[model samples]
Target: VEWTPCRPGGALCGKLAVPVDYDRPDGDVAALALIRFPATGDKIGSLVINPGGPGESGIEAALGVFQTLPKRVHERFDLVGFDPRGVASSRPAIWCNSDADNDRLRAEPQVDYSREGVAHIENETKQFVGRCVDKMGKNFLAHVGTVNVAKDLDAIRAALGDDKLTYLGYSYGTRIGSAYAEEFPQRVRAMILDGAVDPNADPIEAELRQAKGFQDAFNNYAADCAKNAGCPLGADPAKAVEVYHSLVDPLVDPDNPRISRPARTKDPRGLSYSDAIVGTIMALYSPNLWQHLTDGLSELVDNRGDTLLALADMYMRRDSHGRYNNSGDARVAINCVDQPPVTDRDKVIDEDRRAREIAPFMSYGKFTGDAPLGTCAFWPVPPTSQPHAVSAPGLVPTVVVSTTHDPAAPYKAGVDLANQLRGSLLTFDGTQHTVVFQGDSCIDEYVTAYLIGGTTPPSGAKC
Candidate 1:
């Protein structure tokens, strides 16, 4: 490992070679892209941070940290961020489809829930998986899961000359951190898992909980909107959900002229029902974007989708030029290997029905038959991990931060994770997804103390 000055900030950048498959230590290696914002004062050690895409570039996350993290954290520890295997600037990067192909796929209208329609979506996923295997080899995809990423993190810790790991991981990165704890519990000094993911959650059940989580967040947003003038969902918060359904359910109607058509004159790309749903969920991650969601929905009434499409593009990491970052590709590639596939048609259909029942906002037009299978079913590599309660016997009390109204990682998952790890749970009574260093003084205080002072807050601490 070596360091050199790079980029838009004063941070030092470098890379480390880690075995692609730890099972064969002498095999091919992938270069983990690394960035370090050096401590301004006395350095305790490196504080590795991950923003949790399972594919998001930690280098970019580090850059953001340089600009946003509390000064004391920057003054004491080197803020280190690494691009995990198969992610940006890392070797054997996953590329499932080209920009044009992705754009074409996005432009395609949403299909109904008929068996034939479900198969159409499944075929699309199969095509995607086939393309990924064709582009990035199956061997590389297999090794990109959380287990390997945890190993990579340890390798990075060793490279940084840290005797023990000090980490901050959110969302999917929480899973990576938990995997690390399972593998190298004795090697951890301080670990903070924000927006925790329960290691033992059944895949379908987890999805249902997350769907319900989003519905809760939406309800919060609607309640807030109802208090303000000219709320898009109307003056009655109780009717907001109904108003929401009225606005979006029409997208599934084949005869509706407004379905997937652009209302704005400048951007010609229309908003697909799928994208609209995704864009809505993306906005729900943070209340800061709720205004944008409201505006996007308001435009939806007029059949305009520019704002909504733009939000969806942001969520998808698609740029103005139509090119996409590798996050989506790497997300599927990594997740498929980490979690077991849900391919049974009957189970999928049952889960779909339950999901809609639990989360009405997710319900659009009527579903006719079996739900479509995702990319995991068609993945070339078998899963390397399975759902099971994590037990890291010798690990220190890590801090698990949970937001009450997280739209992605449900709050209960955090509670379960804390109990599983025997760690302290810091609950943030907020509406956003992940919480910590996003401008909450109370949460930041506990986290900064844990990182700098190695002091976990009292168990079940609420902020």
Candidate 2:
């Protein structure tokens, strides 16, 4: 391993060679990119951090975002971020689609409920996975799921010569931390899991919860938007949903005039019903984007479809120049390997119906709520992992943070995760995907104390 300097903070960066499959310990291998931000004074060992996505670059997330961490923790523990195998910058990285294919992927709407639409989606998924495996090969694709990532984290721990691990994880990164706790409970020093994803929920249940979560968040946005004068979604909070439907749903009664203004049924930016639905969902991830959602809605009414596509592109990790990252492909590959695929047409139809019922705003044009199930029905291989509870029996108290209205991972999962691990809970009554260090000093202060001072706050800690 040859460590070099990475910009933005002069952090040390390097790669470690790890076996492709742990079972073969001594066979084919790949490198995991690593970055180390050394503590300046009175070091307290290393703090490994993951910013989730199963596809996001942990290195970039830690360096770009968390460099603002509390000075005490910053000066004590080295902040380390490693790109898990198959993610950006890591060796054998998976890029399953060409620029042209990515354009098509985003341009096309979600699967319609028709039999042919189902077939079309399945075929596209199969082809996508085929291309991923064709490029990555079976060995590389076979060992890139959560279990392996947990093991890799342990390997990193060993490499750093740390007998214990201090870690922070967000969203899907919680899974990695949970798996690590299970695999090596004795190695835990302090762990902070925020925006927890319930490991107990099955694929179907997971999708359902997320669907409703987004639905609720959208309504919250609608309520807030209704009070704004220039809001195109209508000024009457009670009729916000109705006004929104009128603007996006082509089938709405063209003559209906709502409480404040007439419904703008005509597509201003040529945004399809599906386009409006998805674009809105994407913007609801954070409260900071509420203005974006309001603007994107008006843009749709004004006949500027590009605004909707821009939101979609941001969610898909496509840049302004038209090139896309491997996050989309990696998410598909990692998810298929991690969760069981849904292939039955009957089951697919039933789920879509349920989703639409849960999130009507998602039903635009021929698309159902949310994109059809997790896009892995046609993966080349069966799932390698499943949901299970994790318990770090002998570790010190941990912290699990949750927001009441987190659209990506609901609040109950955070409660459940804390219970399973016997960890303390930090509840933030908000509607954003994140809570810690995103402007909440209450959380940041409490979390920093726990990580560096070994001070566990009260159970059900509200900040």
Candidate 3:
């Protein structure tokens, strides 16, 4: 691989060809997209990073992180980010749906959880899965899981001329990091797994816990919203749930078009219940965006979803031109291929019911209703990995940072991963997700020192 100077002249971009199937020594290869922000001073080695999503563009993440990264870290280590196989900038990218189709899907009405609604969703899921299989075929789908990504990381490590891997993985990126730890433990020099997902969680259990995590985050947001004078959920914390329902529940009825009634957007496409809820979920990820959520909900009072829809667009990585990046499709393909397919419809329904009960803010529709078998159920290939505790026996000490109230990747999963790897657990006593180097002096000091010179923080230490 030859590095070419990209933006900023100092930064480098390149591509690497890695086997899609490790089982076959001379099989199909994936050309991975790579970006590097070189150290301004003497460089120690490459510190590869992944910003989660299992599908998020690491090349893009590196470009963004270079702007705010600690000077010391940047001066010491080359920051490298790579788009995993089938992700953005990578060849043979997985795009199951067209831009217009995705926009239409987002602008569709929310699922009421009725039998008819479930049927509609099921049909949609089948079609989406079919598109993936039809377009990419099963051979391509078979090898995009985290395990393969970990193997690719090893290839990346060797190509970067690093004898050992120094990595910082966030959110679902932790999955990739942990898998690498298991696969190539001795090759790890220093690694940080932030906002981790438990390796031991079954798909159903994982979904349930994530739903609970989001619900808790929303409750925290609601409590905070109650502190303000003109909070959309009202100024009373006790009635917050009720007030929230009053605002979003009107969009539940698909029979009665909620667009003209309660959830109207300034855009001609109108605000769909699905987009409103997705936008709400998007805002819940960061407390800095809590004000946006409050403002959006306030606009919902006037039956406007412009703010929420914009937030939703950000979440979906859709542009102003109504075009979407491959994130959504990549997320679906990677996620479905990573976890074991859910075969039991009853189990899915039970978990959905449990999720609704626990997450009332997200449960505006019918409470006691069946769930459409998810897209993963119809995945083209069998799961590449299974739920099991990781025992990277020869791996060096690592750092795991867990935000105490992460909505997507729960905090407990972080603790579990730290324990599994026998790594240090650095806890961020905050409500937002993934808190490393996000302008927090405490987290930055701890993580930066660790990443720069392998100074591991004390386990269970709170920032």
Candidate 4:
């Protein structure tokens, strides 16, 4: 099924019917929603874009950043956005009871485990997992994974009559792109992966790296906040850290005298002190809203909880409208399926303890606790059986961009991915999540030259 002229000025929108299980192409199919902005200039091959979510809907992200994409690339290749399977706008998109579940998860206090605290978190984790399984069911839950989505991409490529695929992926979308390259290396043209995640890394390692990245980012923010006039935090970075830690520390213990009214939720109101800490760490993922972080810190220093609450709300993606997106659902589903957790609860507990020991100042114990287990503990699905390595052996040159301080995909991972793909170029020395629309003129030029003129950057290029 195809849709035409869904957007103004005759932009095409359609659904590509792909099999629910790619291994059985002749079996049940699901409609993958797609939007294509055809090239206005001489046509290059189509550029398939995936906005990184593991769960983030590419269609929404592409629409959100459409105006910002490099102009030459836009005019040359048809920009195609499709909802990855089990993500928003795609049939069988992951959904929960409401946005409230997201809010509860983020607000839950994260405390270092006192024996009692550990038991409490375990119960909460089990309950949260149960609620998801009960509401979504095992069948739907089982299908929401990255490998299935990668196969879905191949199906979309065939349906569109493209001999090869050119891709631009951000954040977790890098994983999707890599998976595609591994599955169908011969069909690759050019791919630009921004905020690249290491496909080979396990979940514990990835989350640990993310925790360290956020700590570094917080330090960077603190330094910047000291210099910026708008910063509510004081000019001395040391003083700012002291003030912020003071406000955050009490959140771990619900009964602490510092917290006037401890963070609570209705769907699942209670949180361990550890959950609160994890909540704060998750809030730092997007740098665009760092101003809000400063505001939250300022409010905490002033004995006002509103700013922190608002910041938490924003991280949870709750707007004036009641509608909410399922980032958490997508994150867990994709991560769980893509990299299943270590399995032994004791091992996860040990790893969580180790992670806390390593990064106590930022995420506290929750960083380790949340990283190794919980959401996927009882994930109702079996993971995909695809090969671990995605090899784009004969692909046209691909560009992999990496940011030094990206909380999720670190710079080293990008370099590694580029090395793995034959003739792929690596762009280094960036600090944003994805380089494509993050306002780096150098990156824009290199990528546009490739997309528009079919020119690939020299191997070992550093942006």
Candidate 5:
């Protein structure tokens, strides 16, 4: 197939057809969209980079980070971004059934997962999952798991005529990369998995770890906000925590004063208290945007809700045409299949209890509020394989980067993933997620050396 321009500056786009079911190559085929920035000099090999989100579009991420790549590294290797099957730009992209349903679900009141709340969320999960199965059907949805994605990666590699694969993966992408290494250990050239996931951890454990990680990050933000000159909650970290919690508590109370007031946005439909709290929590993941969150929180505490509304607008990806571009539907579709529902009803109930106890402030809503649990409850298909440990034996050197305080992928998860991969190097001690891509010279130097010279950073190196 001929390659076409994807982006203005020498980036090429093309599609490669792979079997929908690798086991039945002749049955059906799916088209994978590929974007490539060819090497400036003699090509060393091709490197595929994935930016987290089981639903995140890698092509967008690669284009965003293209300029930040080290000159020598970019000159030697062609950078490739492939949209995973069923994701955006890939054939048969998954879209949620209705924008109205998306907004309602996102703006729904935060449930504490108390007896009533637990039942409500469980029912919600089943409804959401069933809607997806009804809409997307069982055929394509079942194949969206990471294992199949791994097989697709190998097919891409072979089709590209590469002897081995080089990769950079972040967040959920780590799981994808790990699966690739396990399936094609001998074909790995070099890989870096930032914000790694523990392959051995079950979906519930992973979600719990994610919840706790966010709590840790908020604690850090609290401490920072307390010390900052314009901290709205004052110089006392305790007071800041109290202020934040107080703002969220009212939303949980049916008779709270703020419930009937017009939402900050002018949508005839008003916002719920859960909208303000959960929206802020999601926005806090990036440090660059922390200022907006701090200001938004301050506005809420001081009786002004517009700032928080703006932040929510950004998170929801609401644009004109009354549509949201985010892949919330795709996120649910893949997450449900990737992490099968908590089949044991009792276990699901128990986890909610534990979530409440562990993170009292955000637990009630965030834990029970996500799409994973709800979607998995009525997912149309069973997990393709039982959750199993991943080990990459006889692979080329790989790097695992972990942040000390990432809300999504905890640092310990990174260490665990590195241990699972034989001879992989682990880099710890960063305050950001997935290698300091914004402006980290230290990390840039190490990553450049690896991609260019095939050198591994010393184990336990901190950046």
Candidate 6:
């Protein structure tokens, strides 16, 4: 109950101790990082907020986004953010090798997609897994799954003296919230899940769904780009995407850089095809950034890729100093362990093709996609969690909100999640990834009412 200052007059930071494994509550413990923005208005309880990524820093979100929330919300509930197990500010935070090695991998070009290319990545995945084990140790590696994080969250809820949990989660954060709801249904007072993940989706299916979402988003951006005078692809929207492919596909050619270490701009050496695909997916998440997307694409005409590369760096949370936080590391580790491994080259190729067909603009040009976490296909460790349906029988009304065009977490997944939980679905017909608290008064009003008045939106509600 004792709270000291971490942000002085602002949010206070602290730590909580929880078992490494819920099965052995008395055994190995880890200290979790926490941030709390004290409630200024009539207080009900703490409203825990997660920004997804399974890797994104909830504490970071508290500082950057919590303030942007409705003033009444800040007045009514203490905005709480916690770094899950193996995440930042927590004890035993996961770290692989040095940032140098990580940067190399991020920048490395995916070579031609022959058997040889797939095999190369397989070896790389295995090596990276080994590095993580060596750096973080077997015990810590064993405890980095969402299920364990969910258990820790319950411990957090109890420690905070909340009789029941009120939560707000976005994208992958929905995964954590879904786990918490399933694990402790009776303890939920009220919850708002935005940009939800379908717990029912198998690993490969989740990747494809996200791919399709981003593809749709890219097309949306293209249509907008066509109308602008600076449109690089001219008036035809499809041509805009085609022009994009023309610029990036060549980077996948085995002889990338086309020469020995060309300049970083016009002849940006080592700008991999995989980076281009991932960068596009990253920028399309928020419609607020679509203009930046167009600007990046237009730069391609001038032989400049710094804007696009900067976009990719943002996805990985890489700073201008070239230093990286543990977010990327935990992202790979947590997601890989959560997913079913896909090791077969044929399966990878088929999935890659399917992804391309669905999201041609965002698809991997060289038949590589960021799924199955095949990067751990040959890992030294195995997953502590697996895919399962997230359902809560007789759980009191929980509100699930979705954007029609969430680029990372598909809208269909959100609908399926709401249906599975027997929860009310409040839909936002928008282009942003998550609509709640982002500007849509319709979505904001519904969520705010749910959190405060204990009201749930109508079934099949549209905003």
Candidate 3 local lDDT, 1-463, one digit each (tens): 8999874537888999998789896888889999987888888899898999977999999888787789899888899999999999999899889997787677666554678767878888888888888889898899999889999999999999999999999999999998999989889889998899898987888788888888889889989988888899988877887887787666656455323233777776666777778888999899999999998899888877789889989999988888889999999889887878888989988988888888877776556557778888888698888889998888898999998899998889898999999989999988888888688998889988898778999756898
**Candidate 3 wrong stretches, greater than 4 Å:** 7-9, 254-262
Deviation from native of the Cα of residue 391 in model 6, angstroms: 2.6
Residues 205-261 of candidate 1: C-alpha lDDT, one tens digit per residue: 899888888889989999998998888799998898889877776665556422454
Worst 10 residues of 2 by lDDT: 256-265
Model 1 misplaced regions, further than 4 Å: 256-259
Q: Sort by lDDT, best first: what order?
A: 1, 3, 2, 6, 5, 4
Q: What TM-scores do the predictions have?
A: 0.97, 0.91, 0.97, 0.87, 0.91, 0.93
User: Candidate 4 vs. truth: CA RMSD?
Assistant: 3.8
Off by over 4 Å in 5: 112-119, 256-263, 266-271, 364-373
- Candidate 1 weakest lDDT stretch, 10 residues: 256-265
Q: Give the TM-score of candidate 1.
A: 0.97
Colliding residue pairs in candidate 1: none
Reference-based TM-score, model 3: 0.97
Q: What lDDT does each candidate get? A: 0.86, 0.79, 0.85, 0.67, 0.73, 0.77
Residues 1-463 of candidate 2 have per-residue lDDT tens digits of 6788874785898899889889999998889999998888898899899989989889888876554788878888898999999999998898899988876554444435455555666677767777887898887888889889999998999888788999999999999988888889999899999999877777787788999999899889988887788888887767776677766654222332111121233322234444456678889998888888888778657645566656766787878677788887887788778867776656766777787788877764444333343467767667777877776677678899999999999999999999999989999998989777677889889988998888988866787
Of candidate 6, the 10-residue stretch with the lowest lDDT total is 254-263
Local accuracy of candidate 6 as per-residue lDDT tens digits, 149-260: 8888888899888999989988888888888888899999998999988878877778888777777888888888888887876788867667877776665543632222
Model 4: CA > 4 A from native: 7-10, 23-27, 229-233, 238-240, 252-287, 364-372, 385-387, 423-425
lDDT of 4 at 172: 78
Badly placed stretches (over 4 Å) of model 6 are: 7-9, 252-263, 266-272, 363-373
* lDDT of model 6 at position 105: 72
Q: What is the lDDT of residue 311 in candidate 5?
A: 70
Residues 1-463, model 4: lDDT tens digits: 4657774333688888777765676766677888887877877778888887667777777676677767777678788888887777888676654666555544555443555555666676677667777776676666767777778888878777788888888877887888788778888777788877766666677667776777676677778888988566578876765656667666554454222245343323333343434445555666666776776666555544555565555555556564577766767767676665567877777677765655555644244243334666666676654335556566666778777777667677777777776545556563446667667788788888876666888866777
